[PDB]
Design an enzyme around this catalytic site. Structure first.
Site, PDB file in Angstrom:
ATOM      1  N   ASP A  97      25.992  16.759  19.796  1.00  0.00           N
ATOM      2  CA  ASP A  97      24.699  17.425  19.882  1.00  0.00           C
ATOM      3  C   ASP A  97      24.092  17.122  21.243  1.00  0.00           C
ATOM      4  OD1 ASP A  97      25.228  18.131  17.300  1.00  0.00           O
ATOM      5  OD2 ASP A  97      23.534  17.064  16.402  1.00  0.00           O
ATOM      6  N   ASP A 128      23.295  13.915   8.900  1.00  0.00           N
ATOM      7  CA  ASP A 128      23.955  13.617  10.164  1.00  0.00           C
ATOM      8  C   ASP A 128      23.966  12.111  10.379  1.00  0.00           C
ATOM      9  OD1 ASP A 128      24.711  16.153  10.927  1.00  0.00           O
ATOM     10  OD2 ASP A 128      22.935  16.520  12.167  1.00  0.00           O
TER      11      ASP A 128
END
Lengths: 144, 151
Positions: A97, A128
């Protein structure tokens, strides 16, 4: 986003192989919109979201509001999935990310392994896993 | 110090009896390896690993090669104990196994424990681990058990 030395070299590694895995990669790509009201349409009513270093949100309302909150302080800039798999209605994504802190204008590539739970093509759960400290330091923004 | 043994089922965990059990040979090897972690025995664990392998607790630098893994895992086992594991979910695809677990880790210098929420990935070829990466937050662990692993 450097291809980590351990990332598969197989051309299919981070690509979808089932309708559910397809929904996730599309949802992952949509994150760059930073639009909680847009993203919540991927979620079922009975759902939850948790960035595991932080508390979890339960309910479609709580998830939308939590995502909106995150987007008032951080921009989802880019994503690349190196591995994606699934079993028993759970989709796992090892990815990177690219996050950008708005208050300080700094960015950091977060190594993430996520899990998604889907029923009837909608997300009933999303978590996550990553390290929060190194992200916070790299962008001079505490999130706890 | 006190710390309870029962690990509560997360509210988000799957109630599907098949979600947390091994359905393929690669998933069974991983569950055997997760039960073998409580040995804190690098010499016993490295037998699961291929020669071309790697390991990384992502908040910490990685170890590449079978020898590097063994020395890194052994190093961990001098400061922390692996007291218990429960895997809520295990999944598999294209030679990669994923496991959502809680690692009950204890810091040997202080005796304190902490439930570490972990999501892991395993790479296997011919039943041998060519890679293992565990994603979690390190600061949570360091502060809870008072064991600094990163400066």
């Amino acid at each position: 986003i450097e291809q980590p030395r351990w990332a598969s070299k197989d051309s299919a590694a981070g690509a979808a192989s089932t309708p559910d895995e397809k929904i996730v990669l599309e949802f992952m790509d949509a994150l760059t919109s930073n639009d909680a009201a847009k993203l919540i349409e991927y979620f079922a009513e009975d759902t939850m979201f948790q960035a595991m270093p932080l508390p979890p949100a339960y309910g479609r309302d709580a998830v939308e509001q939590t995502l909106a909150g995150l987007f008032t302080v951080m921009s989802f800039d880019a994503v690349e999935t190196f591995h994606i798999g699934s079993s028993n209605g759970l989709v796992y994504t090892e990815r990177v990310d690219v996050l950008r802190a708005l208050p300080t204008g700094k960015s950091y590539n977060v190594s993430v392994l996520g899990v998604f739970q889907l029923t009837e093509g909608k997300i009933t759960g999303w978590r996550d896993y990553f390290d929060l400290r190194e992200f916070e330091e790299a962008v001079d923004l505490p999130l706890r």
